[PDB]
Amino acid sequence: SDLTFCEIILMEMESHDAAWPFLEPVNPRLVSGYRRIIKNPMDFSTMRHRLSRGGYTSSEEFAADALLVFDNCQTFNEDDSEVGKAGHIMRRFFESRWEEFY
Numbered sequence: 675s676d677l678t679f680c681e682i683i684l685m686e687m688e689s690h691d692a693a694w695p696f697l698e699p700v701n702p703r704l705v706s707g708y709r710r711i712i713k714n715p716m717d718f719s720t721m722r723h724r725l726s727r728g729g730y731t732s733s734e735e736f737a738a739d740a741l742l743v744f745d746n747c748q749t750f751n752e753d754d755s756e757v758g759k760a761g762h763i764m765r766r767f768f769e770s771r772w773e774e775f776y
């Protein structure tokens with residue numbers, strides 16, 4: 675249904691060169707101040723796990739999680755940091771692929 679498109683998008687994000695910051699949850703033990711600043715963490719493997727057990731009712735819920743990944747990225751990382759730069763590439767990728775399905 676709407677979920678077949680989400681499988682395609684998520685697969686293509688997981689394999690993207692710039693996905694390396696977002697494949698795994700941030701470990702707050704390793705990242706000073708992350709727990710304080712980011713209220714709702716999100717990453718591609720959490721989305722993949724939620725998709726695998728069917729925890730998305732609509733495509734709009736899937737997109738909310740994706741946008742959360744990149745909102746969190748821009749909140750915590752400078753736009754010219756290595757992670758910020760990758761997050762902009764991944765955000766533009768997502769917005770572009772989402773639009774040529776809907």
Ligand SMILES: CCc1c(-c2csc(N3CCNC[C@@H]3C(=O)NCCC(F)(F)F)n2)[nH]c(C)c1C(C)=O
Nearest residue numbers: 694695696697698700704705708746747750751757
């Ligand atoms: C900047 C942290 C961060 C990552 C992320 C995922 S893998 C990775 N890297 C691994 C290899 N190269 C170093 C670099 C790194 O700095 N890791 C943590 C620092 C330390 F202490 F472990 F070295 N960073 N992803 C997101 C979404 C992040 C944030 C805060 O938004």
Ligand SMILES: [Mg+2]
Nearest residue numbers: 741742744745
């Ligand atoms: Mg937004």
